[PDB]
């Protein structure tokens, strides 16, 4: 059998017995085949419905208990066996099971002892009976329980980012049934940025919260903080969903969505205007975004007809998410909490944003069609259909009840997107996976991302360039090194994926679905330098981490035995020139121009050998994979020699060698050379323009301002005429016009 055999039988008996009572009385016999088709989140709901009409069947109740046993939900599985046993006492084997499970999970309660006594009298002195007697004894005493707790706390003092240890603390709290303390630590720990990124931790967070909601302790205590803990569950769901989608398989991700949707429906009714309501707002967006990402995962593997329909469906999901407004940040109790919520908001807009674009670039105003056709409520049922099995109640599912009102159907603006990315760099702890994705999403766009601003958001007060550039010791790491690194990681990643699909779209993959986009070498380095900088390394591993970084430094700086293809160096050079050429301050201009000249000075020897059609000495285990896809050709050499000579002149100008800089700039009639010629002629004029000074000099001073005006005009004249020149502008066109207005009013 398969999925089709069992879900097609739905229409078989649906067409034979359509009334609700008989439809649910077939649930046990529906669930009979899903247990065989390896569907346990589905089989669970099928049998559970038959139990809603046939609540006195010991077979059905046991079957659910045996299914909750596969789910490892001890509290739920035990209760099911209990019902089957109290209905039918002859089920001896279940009395053993109950006694077996009660002693394995927790012995503190005498209930485990009672069921063990009965299990003994049903199986006199059987081999299992003693086994359970030893198990019940195994559990430690009061002094023993306290002993374990002190270890975890003393262990958590120095290792607060350890996933396993924090999990054990929640389990120890849960073993003493002080769940309030379990959630209390669980809440104070959702502020940890590392734990929030742990798949297994968030899974524990979902359980420990649910356990507390149903727990007797939650009701007795008060209903005031009930809302507070409820927020974390939604937050946990969002994080857990992001992680499950990437690592887990198609089935597990879909199942988590249902838990997400159940929580949303249960939360919307309360509403209000506090942190919980604001949290519901932002998490609502995440739901669709991840749901869209989830949709695209299924279609990737599937055929073309389903792909377009699913991508159409996903496009709507991402759209819904992007539309959702920035959550009300002021409304949260604390600075940490509110800053977190905004961070996630930026993540939502950024991820959904690029997806909305990459899906809309396929066709012309493709977005408009998506809304005009599927914004209809018919789409809401087509979405629930593709995502879930229709058998689940469509009433308590948030997806089916949401009011899809006035979809903006407006593609995102790049400027807004940039500030979303920059604000969300800390969303996923700056995993090189995160950044390499963003960097690639901008690789297809005409505007480039503010990478230098990304790094400033991550490694604060890390100098742009280190004074002690002589050595490769990793205490001298600089934001330039990182910027130069990410450039290669993305330039490398793009080429690798390009080669993959050629053997078999690459931009369209969502962030969770795609696999590692960088080499484990690169990832190890980034994780190392990150742990080092943020001061979350290990005293013992310091020397190792330190050396791991040191190894690659000599390559990021194009020193001895750099594993750098000439094309990657050139890309670094120009990408830094133009990156620096647009900066306002001199410190930054100098640095970025310096590095650009440096890399240039390393390439030109290679280009000369390549200029005569010779062979480049290939590398030994390079850090950045070589590719013949972008191997430099003679057709492009003279351009680089020219483009490099500009970079030389620019640095000469910044250092003071105006005479040599101008002599070079004037040699080549390029759009960029105009903006440089103009910018330096303006400075010689403005300073001398108004001070008391020799009149003849004043006329010469004015003469330069006259040259400035002319060169800016040549820029705009040639710019408006041809589009290719607009892209060559070292700064935006409006910026050129902005100066010109001031230049002439002077």
């Amino acid at each position, epitope marked *: 059998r398969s999925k089709a055999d069992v879900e097609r039988y739905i229409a078989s008996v649906q067409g034979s017995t359509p009334s609700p009572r008989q439809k649910s009385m077939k649930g046990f016999y529906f669930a009979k085949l899903y247990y065989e088709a390896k569907e346990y989140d589905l089989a669970k709901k099928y049998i559970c419905t038959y139990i809603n009409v046939q609540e006195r069947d010991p077979k059905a109740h046991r079957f659910l208990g045996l299914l909750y046993e596969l789910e490892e939900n001890t509290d739920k599985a035990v209760e099911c066996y209990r019902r089957s046993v109290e209905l039918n006492p002859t089920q001896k084997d279940l009395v053993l099971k109950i006694a077996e499970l009660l002693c394995k999970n927790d012995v503190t309660d005498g209930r485990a002892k009672y069921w063990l006594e009965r299990a003994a009298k049903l199986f006199p002195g059987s081999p299992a009976i003693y086994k359970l007697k030893e198990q019940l004894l195994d559990c430690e005493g009061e002094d023993g329980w306290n002993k374990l707790f002190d270890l975890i706390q003393s262990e958590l003092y*120095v290792r607060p980012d350890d996933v396993h240890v924090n999990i054990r603390l929640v389990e120890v709290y849960r073993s003493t049934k002080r769940l309030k303390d379990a959630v209390a630590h669980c809440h104070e720990a959702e502020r940890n940025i590392a734990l929030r990124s742990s798949l297994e931790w968030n899974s524990c967070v979902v359980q420990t919260l649910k356990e507390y909601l149903e727990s007797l302790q939650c009701l007795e205590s008060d209903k005031s903080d009930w809302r507070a803990t409820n927020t974390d569950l939604l937050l946990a769901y969002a994080n857990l969903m992001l992680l499950t989608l990437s690592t887990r398989d198609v089935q597990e991700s879909r199942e988590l969505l249902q838990s997400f949707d159940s929580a949303l429906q249960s939360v919307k009714s309360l509403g209000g205007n506090d942190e919980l309501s604001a949290t519901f707002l932002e998490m609502k967006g995440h739901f669709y975004m991840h749901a869209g990402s989830l949709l695209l995962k299924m279609g990737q593997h599937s055929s073309n007809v389903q792909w377009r329909a699913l991508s159409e469906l996903a496009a709507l999901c991402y759209l819904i998410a992007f539309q959702v407004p920035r959550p009300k940040i002021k409304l949260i109790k604390g600075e940490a909490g509110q800053n977190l919520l905004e961070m996630m908001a930026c993540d939502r807009l950024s991820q959904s944003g690029h997806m909305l674009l990459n899906l809309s670039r396929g066709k012309q105003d493709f977005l408009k069609e998506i809304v005009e056709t599927f914004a209809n409520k018919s789409g809401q049922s087509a979405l629930y259909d593709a995502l879930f099995s229709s058998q689940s109640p469509k009433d308590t599912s948030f997806l089916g009840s949401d009011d899809i009102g006035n979809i903006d159907v407006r593609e995102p603006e790049l400027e807004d997107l940039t500030r979303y990315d920059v604000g969300a760099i800390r969303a996923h702890n700056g995993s090189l996976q995160h950044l390499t994705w963003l960097g690639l999403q901008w690789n297809s766009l005409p505007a480039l991302p503010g990478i230098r601003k990304w790094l400033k958001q991550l*490694f*604060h*007060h*890390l100098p742009h360039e280190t004074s002690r550039l002589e050595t490769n010791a990793p*205490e001298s*790491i600089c934001i330039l090194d990182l910027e130069v690194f990410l450039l290669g990681v993305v330039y490398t990643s793009h080429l690798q994926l390009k080669e993959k699909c050629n053997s078999h779209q690459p931009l369209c993959l969502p962030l969770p679905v795609c696999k590692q986009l960088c080499t484990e070498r690169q990832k190890s380095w980034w994780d190392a330098v990150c742990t*080092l*900088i*943020h*001061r*979350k*390394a*290990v*005293p*013992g591993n*310091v020397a190792k*981490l*330190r050396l791991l970084v040191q190894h690659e430094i000599n390559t990021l700086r194009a020193q001895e035995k750099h594993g750098l293809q000439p094309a990657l160096l050139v890309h670094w050079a120009e990408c830094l020139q133009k990156m620096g050429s647009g900066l306002n301050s001199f410190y930054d201009q100098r640095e970025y121009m310096g590095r650009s000249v440096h890399y240039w000075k390393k390439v030109l020897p290679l280009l000369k050998i390549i200029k005569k059609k010779n062979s480049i000495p290939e590398p030994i285990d390079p850090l950045f994979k070589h590719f013949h896809s972008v191997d430099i050709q003679a057709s492009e050499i003279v351009e680089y020699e020219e483009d490099a000579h500009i970079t030389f002149a620019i640095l000469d100008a910044v250092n003071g060698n105006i005479e040599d800089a101008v002599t070079a700039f004037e040699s080549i009639k390029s759009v960029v050379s105009y903006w440089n010629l103009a910018l330096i002629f303006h400075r010689k004029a403005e300073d001398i323009e108004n001070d008391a000074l020799s009149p003849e000099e004043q006329e010469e001073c004015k003469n330069y301002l006259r040259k400035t005006r002319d060169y800016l005009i040549k820029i705009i004249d040639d710019s408006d005429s041809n589009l290719s020149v607009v892209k060559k502008l070292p700064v935006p066109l409006e910026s050129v016009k902005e100066m010109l207005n001031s230049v002439m009013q002077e």
Partner: antibody
Amino acid sequence: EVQLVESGGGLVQPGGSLRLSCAASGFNFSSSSIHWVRQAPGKGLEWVASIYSYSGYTSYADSVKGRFTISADTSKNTAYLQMNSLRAEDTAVYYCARSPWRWSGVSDGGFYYKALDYWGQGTLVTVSS
Amino acid sequence: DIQMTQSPSSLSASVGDRVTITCRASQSVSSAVAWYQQKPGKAPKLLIYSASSLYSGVPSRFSGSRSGTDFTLTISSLQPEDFATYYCQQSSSSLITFGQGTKVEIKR
């Protein structure tokens, strides 16, 4: 261009709390170990806290163990000395200082710092009811 | 616990003298000792690190030395600006301890 500035001092009542701030600039705060050293009037130097360079494992003198808490923030490029249950005996001038990773070695049974190169101006803390 | 016993507690000398201060480590300690100069009210400054290595910028008349568990600061020719209090410091496992200090008073 490189300096350490202490702040967050002033007077407080016994059994109260304070928080000192050691703002650093000019050296990569990640690779530096941070220490606090108090000195009562007319008395000598007493080491009270340390933070290993690249990770930040704490270590306090028994005279203040469990009461004080020293921390380091990469984003703010600043270290702090949280002080609780302050006693009249804690009245002293509190200095902070760094020890680069070049001088921070880890050994079986604990770590050692070769010396304290950069020192701060020193912020006064008075504890008297 | 390790203890650095500094001697003498208070010293009196005049300019040009070859002055000596000594600190004894109770337990056998490795060469991870330092020396500091603290002028009245000002901050302590580092003179010698790793027992006998001179901190960059310190005058050449300062020199550190060790013998067994006794560490010794040595000034070849005392100067007027060197009349201040000095301290010795050991760095053992996850612990730092200072000597009681030595005041260098001008003799008359």
